[PDB]
C-alpha cells in the first residue's frame, strides 16, 4: 500500500505542475510595486510581565485580546490603551488566544490541553470560564471561534478539533496530521479552515464534512502560522526554515515564497491587510516583515520589539495592525 | 475625557495595579523544568517536592519553587521547551538502573540529556542532575556489567565507580561555562532531595549574582 | 445579580441616617455604585457616585457636603450617609450598579429601593411629553432635549433611558444612545442626534407601560428628564 501512496502523491504532484503554467510572480510583473510601506507604533499596549504568545483582534477592529505567560489574558482597547479586562488564567502556559467574533467569548489554552472559553459579558462584571474544552492530548496551539458556540482548536497531539461549546464535546476530530499543529486559520465563511503543523505540512479541512480537502507541502521546517487571504481561495504559511509561502485553494499549489537571504530566523505569525497585497510575517529576530503578497518583495519593516514577534494581527477594518512579542508589548501599527 | 472615559481609564489603571502586583508576587519564585524519560525518577521526586503541565509548587526555607513537570505532554518538545526559557534550573532525572534496560534507556536519557544541555533556549541554564534508583542501580550493576550501556567503559564494575562514570558521561554534555550540572544520587526512599534543589537553586543564584559583578 | 437598599423611615429634619445597600450575586467591587432618588411624585434626581475602587466620588451639587458615599467591597455594601436631612430629602433612594470599560452597559441594574421620609452648568435634560396616552401594539416615540449636545469627540451619545414601571425599580432600556441593553426587547429602539433624541417603541405591551426617563452621562452632573409616563 506504500507503493499505492507514493503512486498517488506522484500523481498529484504531476497535476499540481500540469495546472502550474505561469507563476505569481510572472504574472505580477506588470502591476505597481508599493513603495514603501513604513507603519508606526500607534500605541504600546504594556501591562503584560511576561512573554506575549498569541493576540486576537476584535471584530470592532478597536478590541483585542492578548495572551501571556503571566497568566494573564487582557482585552485592550487598542484605542484610548485602556485595559477593559484582565483575565487571570487557571493555566499560565498559554499559548493561544481566540476573540469570538460575537464578541462575548475569548478562548485560550495551551500547555494544560484545554481551550478555556471566558464569558466577557455577565450579568456579574467579572469575566469567568464558561467551557473548559478537555480532549486534547497535546497542546493548544491554536483556536478560533467558528461563532459562540463552536471553536476549532489546533493541537500539539497532531489533530485539530472542533467543539460544541455548550456541551463542551468535540464535534468533529481533524486528523492526518503527523507532527504537531501550530496555528489554524479559518476562511471567511468559516466552512472550512487551514492549519499548518511542524510536518511541515498545510491541511485543508472541511468544518462540516470533518475531511482534510488538501494538502500542502512547500515548507521544509515547521510551519508556525497559518493565514487565509481575504477573498478565502488562498491562505499564507510561516514556517522555521524563514520562509513564506502563498498556497491557493483552487490550483492547489503554492503560488508565492516570501523569503529574503537576510532573513534566516523563523516566523511566529502571519497575516494579510484587508486587502490581501500585504504578508504581514512576524519573525524570530524581533521585528515584523511587511511582504508585497502579489509580488514577494519586503514592503517594510516593523522594528520596534526587543524580543521575538510572536504574534501579529490585522484589524477588520484593515486600519492597524498589532504585534506581540515576547519582550511582552502589543504595538499598534498605521 | 467623558465621564465614562474617566471611569474606563480608572477602571484601567486599578487592572494595571493589579498587573503589578501580580507580577511582583510572581517574581519571587524559583520557576523548575522537571525533564526526564518515562521511567526516570520524575514522579518520585515530585512527590519528594510535595492534564498536559503539571505544576508542583513547594516552599522550602522561604523560597517558593515552581516545578514544572511537562512528562504528560508527548509532542515535538522544541516546540514549547522555549515557555521555560526563564526558569532558574532544569531538574533532570535520570534512571541509574536503566543501563541495563531498554525502551538503551541510558542511552535515551543521555542523548535528551545533551539536547536539554545545548538546547539554544538553555544555553545559560544550570541543572539539577537527579541520578535516580541508586539501590536498584546497585542491586543491578553487582550482576551486570556496566558493558551494556557503555562499551568503551573499560573501569571496574563496582556501584560507586560504575555511578560516577554515568555522572562523567552526563556531565561531559554541558560545553557551557555559564551553567553547571548539579548531580545527586536518590533511591526513591531519601528525604533530602528538597535539599538538594534548594542548595542547587542558592548556588545558581549566587553564580549569576557573582556574574553580573564579574566575579564569575 | 440583586441590590437591596435598607434604612429609610421617617427621620426628623435636620437629622441623620445612613442607607445601605447590600449587595449580592455580581462583582460588586467592579462596579460604580450611584445613589439616585426620586420624590414620591417627581421625577429621577442622581445623588451620588462611588467609583470602583472608591478612587472616584462625586455628588450631586445640591447634597454636596451633606451626604457621603461610601462601598464596603469585602461586604459588598454601598453607603450613604445623610446628615442635615432637609424635606427636599424625602424621596426614594434607588442603588444603581453601574461598570464602565468599552462597551459596557452602565445602570444596567438597580435595587428596590427604601423611602426616606423628612418631616417638618449642569445638562438640562428635557422631555416635556408626559401622560402619552397608548394602546398595545402601537409605535410611539418618546422624545427627548438636551441642554448640551450629548454628543461627546469620541462618537458615543451618553442618553441613557430608563423605564418605571409602576410599582419598582427603573430599568435600563437603552444606554449610550441607540445601544439596547441586555434582557430588553428590540422593539425598544434608541436614536438621536445632537441634543434631540428619540425613544422608539416598534409594538408596545401592557408591560411597557411606565415612566420612560432620559439620563445624560457626558458630565458628569447626571441629570435625568421630566418623565415621559405612558399609560393605557
Known amino acids: 500500500l506504500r507503493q499505492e501512496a507514493e503512486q498517488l502523491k506522484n500523481q498529484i504532484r504531476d497535476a499540481r505542475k500540469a495546472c502550474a503554467d505561469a507563476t505569481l510572480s510572472q504574472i505580477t510583473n506588470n502591476i505597481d510595486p508599493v513603495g514603501r510601506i513604513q507603519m508606526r507604533t500607534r500605541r504600546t499596549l504594556r501591562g503584560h510581565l511576561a512573554k506575549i504568545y498569541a493576540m486576537h483582534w476584535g471584530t470592532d477592529s478597536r478590541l483585542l485580546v492578548s495572551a501571556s505567560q503571566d497568566g494573564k489574558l487582557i482585552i485592550w482597547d487598542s484605542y484610548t490603551t485602556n485595559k477593559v479586562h484582565a483575565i487571570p488564567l487557571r493555566s499560565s502556559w498559554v499559548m493561544t488566544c481566540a476573540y469570538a467574533p460575537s464578541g462575548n467569548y475569548v478562548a485560550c489554552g495551551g500547555l494544560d490541553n484545554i481551550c478555556s472559553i471566558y464569558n466577557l459579558k455577565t450579568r456579574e462584571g467579572n469575566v469567568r470560564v464558561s467551557r473548559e474544552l478537555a480532549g486534547h492530548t497535546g497542546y493548544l496551539s491554536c483556536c478560533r471561534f467558528l461563532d459562540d458556540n463552536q471553536i476549532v482548536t489546533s493541537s500539539g497531539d497532531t489533530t485539530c478539533a472542533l467543539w460544541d461549546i455548550e456541551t463542551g464535546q468535540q464535534t468533529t476530530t481533524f486528523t492526518g496530521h503527523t507532527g504537531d499543529v501550530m496555528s489554524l486559520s479559518l476562511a471567511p465563511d468559516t466552512r472550512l479552515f487551514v492549519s499548518g503543523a511542524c510536518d511541515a505540512s498545510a491541511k485543508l479541512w472541511d468544518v462540516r464534512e470533518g475531511m482534510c480537502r488538501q494538502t500542502f507541502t512547500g515548507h521544509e521546517s515547521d510551519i508556525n502560522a497559518i493565514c487565509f487571504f481575504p477573498n478565502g481561495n488562498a491562505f499564507a504559511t510561516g514556517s522555521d526554515d524563514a520562509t513564506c509561502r502563498l498556497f491557493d485553494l483552487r490550483a492547489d499549489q503554492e503560488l508565492m515564497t516570501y523569503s529574503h537571504d537576510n532573513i534566516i530566523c523563523g516566523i511566529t505569525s502571519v497575516s494579510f491587510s484587508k486587502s490581501g497585497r500585504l504578508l504581514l510575517a512576524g519573525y524570530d529576530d524581533f521585528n515584523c516583515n511587511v511582504w508585497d503578497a502579489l509580488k514577494a518583495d519586503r514592503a517594510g519593516v516593523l522594528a520596534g520589539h526587543d524580543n521575538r514577534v510572536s504574534c501579529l494581527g490585522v484589524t477588520d477594518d484593515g486600519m492597524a495592525v498589532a504585534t506581540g512579542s515576547w519582550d511582552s508589548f502589543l504595538k499598534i501599527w498605521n | 475625557l467623558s465621564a465614562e472615559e474617566r471611569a474606563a481609564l480608572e477602571r484601567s489603571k486599578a487592572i494595571e495595579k493589579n498587573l503589578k502586583e501580580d507580577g511582583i508576587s510572581a517574581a519571587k519564585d524559583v520557576k523548575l523544568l522537571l525533564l526526564g524519560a518515562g521511567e526516570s525518577g520524575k514522579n518520585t521526586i515530585v512527590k519528594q517536592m510535595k492534564t498536559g503541565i503539571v505544576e508542583t509548587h513547594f516552599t522550602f526555607k522561604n523560597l517558593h519553587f515552581r516545578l514544572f513537570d511537562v512528562g504528560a505532554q508527548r509532542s515535538e518538545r522544541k516546540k514549547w521547551i522555549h515557555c521555560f526559557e526563564d526558569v532558574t534550573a532544569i531538574i533532570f532525572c535520570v534512571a541509574l538502573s536503566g543501563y541495563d534496560q531498554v525502551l538503551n534507556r541510558m542511552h535515551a536519557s543521555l542523548k535528551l540529556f545533551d539536547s536539554i544541555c545545548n538546547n539554544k533556549f538553555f544555553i545559560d541554564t544550570s541543572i539539577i542532575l537527579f541520578l535516580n534508583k541508586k539501590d536498584l542501580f546497585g542491586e543491578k550493576i553487582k550482576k551486570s556489567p556496566l558493558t551494556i550501556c557503555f562499551p568503551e567503559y573499560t573501569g571496574p564494575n563496582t556501584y560507586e565507580d560504575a555511578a560516577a562514570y554515568i555522572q562523567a558521561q552526563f556531565e561531559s554534555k554541558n560545553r557551557s561555562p555559564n551553567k553547571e550540572i548539579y548531580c545527586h544520587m536518590t533511591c526513591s526512599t531519601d528525604t533530602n532531595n528538597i535539599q538538594v534543589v534548594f542548595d542547587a537553586v542558592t548556588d545558581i543564584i549566587i553564580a549569576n549574582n557573582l556574574r553580573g559583578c564579574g566575579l564569575y | 445579580v440583586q441590590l437591596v437598599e435598607s434604612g429609610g423611615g421617617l427621620v426628623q429634619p435636620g437629622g441623620s441616617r445612613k442607607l445601605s445597600c447590600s449587595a449580592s450575586?455580581?462583582?460588586?467591587?467592579?462596579?460604580?455604585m450611584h445613589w439616585v432618588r426620586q420624590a414620591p411624585e417627581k421625577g429621577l434626581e442622581w445623588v451620588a457616585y462611588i467609583s470602583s475602587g472608591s478612587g472616584t466620588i462625586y455628588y450631586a451639587d445640591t447634597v454636596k457636603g451633606r451626604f457621603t458615599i461610601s462601598r464596603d467591597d469585602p461586604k459588598n455594601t454601598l453607603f450613604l450617609q445623610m446628615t442635615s436631612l432637609r424635606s427636599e430629602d424625602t424621596a426614594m433612594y434607588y442603588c444603581v450598579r453601574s461598570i464602565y470599560y468599552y462597551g459596557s452597559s452602565p445602570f444596567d441594574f438597580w435595587g428596590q429601593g427604601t423611602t426616606l421620609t423628612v418631616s417638618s452648568s449642569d445638562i438640562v435634560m428635557t422631555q416635556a411629553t408626559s401622560s402619552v396616552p397608548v394602546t398595545p401594539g402601537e409605535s410611539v416615540s418618546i422624545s427627548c432635549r438636551s441642554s448640551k449636545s450629548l454628543l461627546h469627540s469620541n462618537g458615543n451619545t451618553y442618553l441613557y433611558w430608563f423605564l418605571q414601571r409602576p410599582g419598582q425599580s427603573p430599568q435600563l432600556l437603552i444606554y449610550r444612545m441607540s445601544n439596547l441593553a441586555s434582557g430588553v426587547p428590540d422593539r425598544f429602539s434608541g436614536s438621536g442626534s445632537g441634543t434631540a433624541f428619540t425613544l422608539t417603541i416598534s409594538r408596545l405591551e401592557a408591560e411597557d407601560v411606565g415612566v420612560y426617563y432620559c439620563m445624560q452621562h457626558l458630565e458628569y452632573p447626571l441629570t435625568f428628564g421630566a418623565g415621559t409616563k405612558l399609560e393605557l
Open positions: 450575586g455580581f462583582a460588586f467591587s467592579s462596579f460604580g
